[PDB]
Amino acid sequence: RVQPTESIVRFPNITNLCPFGEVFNATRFASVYAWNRKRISNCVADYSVL
Amino acid sequence: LLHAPATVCGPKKSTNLVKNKCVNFNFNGLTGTGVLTESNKKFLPFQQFGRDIDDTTDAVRDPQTLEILDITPCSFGGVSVITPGTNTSNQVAVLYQG
Amino acid sequence: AYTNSFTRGVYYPDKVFRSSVLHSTQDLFLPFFSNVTWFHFDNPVLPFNDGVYFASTSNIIRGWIFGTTLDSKTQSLLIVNNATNVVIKVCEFQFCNDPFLFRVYSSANNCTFEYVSQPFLNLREFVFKNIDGYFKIYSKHTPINLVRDLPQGFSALEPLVDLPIGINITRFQTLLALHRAAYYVGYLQPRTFLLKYNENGTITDAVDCALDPLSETKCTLKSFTVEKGIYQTSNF
Numbered sequence A: 001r002v003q004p005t006e007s008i009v010r011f012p013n014i015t016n017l018c019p020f021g022e023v024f025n026a027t028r029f030a031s032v033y034a035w036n037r038k039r040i041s042n043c044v045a046d047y048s049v050l
Numbered sequence B: 001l002l003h004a005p006a007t008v009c010g011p012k013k014s015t016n017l018v019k020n021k022c023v024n025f026n027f028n029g030l031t032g033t034g035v036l037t038e039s040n041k042k043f044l045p046f047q048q049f050g051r052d053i054d055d056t057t058d059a060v061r062d063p064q065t066l067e068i069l070d071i072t073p074c075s076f077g078g079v080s081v082i083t084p085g086t087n088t089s090n091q092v093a094v095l096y097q098g
Numbered sequence C: 001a002y003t004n005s006f007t008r009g010v011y012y013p014d015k016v017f018r019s020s021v022l023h024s025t026q027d028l029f030l031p032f033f034s035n036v037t038w039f040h041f042d043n044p045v046l047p048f049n050d051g052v053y054f055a056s057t058s059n060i061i062r063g064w065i066f067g068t069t070l071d072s073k074t075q076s077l078l079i080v081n082n083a084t085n086v087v088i089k090v091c092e093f094q095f096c097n098d099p100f101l102f103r104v105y106s107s108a109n110n111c112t113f114e115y116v117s118q119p120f121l122n123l124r125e126f127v128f129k130n131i132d133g134y135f136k137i138y139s140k141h142t143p144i145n146l147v148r149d150l151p152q153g154f155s156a157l158e159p160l161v162d163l164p165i166g167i168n169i170t171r172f173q174t175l176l177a178l179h180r181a182a183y184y185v186g187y188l189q190p191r192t193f194l195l196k197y198n199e200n201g202t203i204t205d206a207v208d209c210a211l212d213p214l215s216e217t218k219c220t221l222k223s224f225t226v227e228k229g230i231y232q233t234s235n236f
């Protein structure tokens, strides 16, 4: 028998960059007594860079 | 987190691609082992995987370059030995199967 | 009119490349030779079920609606061809009795998902399946010459988009518009459809089982041709 040596995994292209810049590069923040809520979906979150 | 289908996921890390060397693989969740090489038959531009009469995986499209690849196992072969009889001499020869 | 289905309603159920072999599957299909209803100007609410056929032949068709209450209470999906694009929105609305073309809905409630397609300025066939929060849409463009209902030509159905909405749908209605009609509906059911794939990968022909004894005979032997002689299909 021949045993395999390497192990490769390929996945589709990554292009769903989540809109997280505007959240942290925001011109204004809402007042604490009336906080603003934002929901996101269908995006890939780069938790690492944050 | 609910029972609805998920929408947000972490960035999956994509590895490299190698051929002509029997190695483990995993494409889009499809796992297995074999030898990777090009083919000639062309899928329709909405299909992945690829089967045979024995309904086992036979081809796959690499989901970054959009090209056809072929698969082949590498675990054949039984070991056999030829002996002229230990009564006379000890030199032997080895025969593999396939 | 209760016209009869003529060898239509077959779609690639899986992402495979089975080549030059026959294959049998267990999935929702349109039973061969079924009485489907002809509709020509007013359209009432039609009861949506698991699986549905649709074909028409103009550009009067604009979209579809789906939901149960249709009164901005439970989430409902809207699909419609924008005058310049295609609108894919998931926002429960207060719908009108006869929406058309902004005489569509009274008000916009909370929203979950939206999608805007690219700007989009004979017989078009549509089949919709909804399973496990996934909406599947199949279309097949076809140049035609007949001026009647479903002709005897045979064609395949290709998948377009999966919708991970995760919602529940029970009813639907067609979306049209008026400037200041011919379409059909078919209902699916679970069956045992044999499928034939050529070398290229196209479904050149298929055979239904449980239709006629000869059909079951073809079903058991996994062949489109049977030699002379007795056989044994099932038990009574």
Ligand SMILES: *[C@@H]1O[C@H](CO)[C@@H](O[C@@H]2O[C@H](CO)[C@@H](O)[C@H](O)[C@H]2NC(C)=O)[C@H](O)[C@H]1NC(C)=O
Binding pocket: A013, B064, B065, B066
């Ligand atoms: C996924 O990203 C890769 C990144 O390299 C794309 O590869 C491109 O391939 C074309 C083919 O000649 C080259 O001209 C480009 O220079 C490559 N890079 C880029 C960034 O385009 C690949 O095309 C992408 N996948 C798809 C489906 O487009």
Ligand SMILES: *[C@@H]1O[C@H](CO)[C@@H](O)[C@H](O)[C@H]1NC(C)=O
Binding pocket: B087, B088, B089
């Ligand atoms: C083979 O076995 C026989 C058994 O007696 C023995 O006499 C003979 O010597 C053996 N062969 C050799 C080459 O020694």
Ligand SMILES: *[C@@H]1O[C@H](CO)[C@@H](O)[C@H](O)[C@H]1NC(C)=O
Binding pocket: C082, C083, C084, C085, C087, C119
């Ligand atoms: C239709 O398209 C126009 C221009 O592309 C856009 O402004 C409008 O919002 C679209 N309709 C809907 C309901 O989104």
Ligand SMILES: *[C@@H]1O[C@H](CO)[C@@H](O)[C@H](O)[C@H]1NC(C)=O
Binding pocket: C109, C110
């Ligand atoms: C649905 O919309 C109404 C608008 O009055 C809102 O009060 C409610 O919170 C929304 N539901 C969800 C689940 O967001």
Ligand SMILES: *[C@@H]1O[C@H](CO)[C@@H](O)[C@H](O)[C@H]1NC(C)=O
Binding pocket: C198, C199, C200, C202
């Ligand atoms: C089969 O594929 C070949 C190669 O692409 C093509 O030339 C031929 O027209 C195809 N035939 C059918 C029936 O699809």
